[PDB]
Design an enzyme around this catalytic site. Structure first.
Site, PDB file in Angstrom:
ATOM      1  N   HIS A 182     -25.636  72.448  35.920  1.00 11.28           N
ATOM      2  CA  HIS A 182     -26.728  71.772  35.274  1.00 11.28           C
ATOM      3  C   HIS A 182     -27.126  72.272  33.715  1.00 11.28           C
ATOM      4  CE1 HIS A 182     -28.453  71.415  39.466  1.00 11.28           C
ATOM      5  NE2 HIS A 182     -28.178  70.134  38.868  1.00 11.28           N
ATOM      6  N   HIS A 209     -24.937  61.831  37.364  1.00 14.96           N
ATOM      7  CA  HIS A 209     -25.264  63.015  37.362  1.00 14.96           C
ATOM      8  C   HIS A 209     -24.457  64.019  38.153  1.00 14.96           C
ATOM      9  CE1 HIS A 209     -28.191  66.600  37.182  1.00 14.96           C
ATOM     10  NE2 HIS A 209     -27.839  66.808  38.703  1.00 14.96           N
ATOM     11  N   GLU A 210     -24.317  63.615  39.627  1.00 19.54           N
ATOM     12  CA  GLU A 210     -23.601  64.139  40.485  1.00 19.54           C
ATOM     13  C   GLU A 210     -21.964  64.227  40.246  1.00 19.54           C
ATOM     14  OE1 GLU A 210     -24.671  66.207  42.518  1.00 19.54           O
ATOM     15  OE2 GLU A 210     -26.628  65.761  42.341  1.00 19.54           O
TER      16      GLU A 210
END
Ligand code: 3EK
Ligand code: CA
Ligand code: CA
Ligand code: CA
Ligand code: ZN
Ligand code: ZN
Length: 164
Positions: A129, A119-120
């Protein structure tokens, strides 16, 4: 003369990263494996390649910290904020910080380091996002009951819009 690009993305395909320090919760090897897996998520869906460095300045500097750790985004103890990463750029661009007040794991317990890193590193590559609750880039960690990790179409479309 030169001008800045409007959309934040890496202009080079061969990117480097460095693990500056390590969480106590996992072995060096397990932490290294989690980050490599997380980078393979993105190299499988883009022309990007990622190479680990053992010293010096990498494009993506990975570190663990708690509370205040040298930026405007202090961590908050267990849960809440798990990590954050900076968008593509020089200096801090790409860097990924992980909250060491989390219980980091290679399982469904605590917070899965691979999953949070995947994700990061999306953020490191220029993604924001998602509003899709099933997306990798949805802001809230939601460990599902699936056997294997699969990158959703939402995230694939997002990353393709930057890297083709
Ligand atoms: C596409 C996607 C998948 C999953 C998810 N949950 C369990 N899995 C099955 C996998 C099995 C192999 C595990 C293994 O390889 O060990 C890693 C997980 N995949 C979870 C999320 C998710 O929580 N997205 C939002 C989010 C993620 C991280 C974060 F920091 C903040 C929000 N997104
Ligand atoms: Ca950097
Ligand atoms: Ca936290
Ligand atoms: Ca910890
Ligand atoms: Zn930070
Ligand atoms: Zn995020």
């Amino acid at each position: 003369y030169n001008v800045f690009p409007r959309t934040l993305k890496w202009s080079k395909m061969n990117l480097t990263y460095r693990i500056v320090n390590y969480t106590p919760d996992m072995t060096h090897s397990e932490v290294e494996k989690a980050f490599k897996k997380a980078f393979k998520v993105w190299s499988d869906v883009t022309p990007l390649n990622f190479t680990r460095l053992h010293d010096g300045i990498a494009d993506i500097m990975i570190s663990f910290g708690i509370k205040e750790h040298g930026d405007f985004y202090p961590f908050d103890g267990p849960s809440g904020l798990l990590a954050h990463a900076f968008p593509p750029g020089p200096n801090y661009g790409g860097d990924a910080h992980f909250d060491d007040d989390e219980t980091w794991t290679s399982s469904s317990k605590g917070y899965n380091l691979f999953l949070v890193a995947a994700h990061e590193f999306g953020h490191s590559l220029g993604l924001d996002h998602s509003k899709d609750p099933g997306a990798l880039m949805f802001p809230i960690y939601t460990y599902t009951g699936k056997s294997h990790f699969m990158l959703p179409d939402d995230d694939v479309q997002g990353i393709q819009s930057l890297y083709g």
